[PDB]
């Protein structure tokens, strides 16, 4: 139920996910974190997660998209 308030935490995950520190998560950046976190994902499996989060259709997950993906059911 607590999603909108997760901002405090969801915001911390960004800095950890964004290795480039540019403010944008790509398919290669996300998959990179999943590996270290302990999750194996293929180039296709990852790309499928990016599109679901990509609201602008640019191929990158931003802050507004990060919360949406987390607050998606």
């Amino acid at each position: 139920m607590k999603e909108q308030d997760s901002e405090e935490e969801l915001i911390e995950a960004f800095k950890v996910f964004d290795r480039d520190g540019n403010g944008l998560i790509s398919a290669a950046e996300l998959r990179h974190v999943m590996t270290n976190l302990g999750e194996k994902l293929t180039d296709d499996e990852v790309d499928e997660m990016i599109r679901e989060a990509d609201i602008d259709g640019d191929g990158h997950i931003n802050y507004e998209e990060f919360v949406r993906m987390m607050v998606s059911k």
Binding site: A13, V16, M34, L37, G38, E39, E48, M70, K73
Partner: peptide, 27 residues
């Protein structure tokens, strides 16, 4: 094709859960 709209969400949700359980040492 099943899309995995729900399953895909768990893969990301679970991944974050571990990060919290690890970071959130509490004590």
């Amino acid at each position: 094709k099943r899309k995995q709209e729900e399953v895909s969400a768990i893969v990301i949700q679970r991944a974050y859960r571990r990060y919290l359980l690890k970071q959130k040492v509490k004590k």
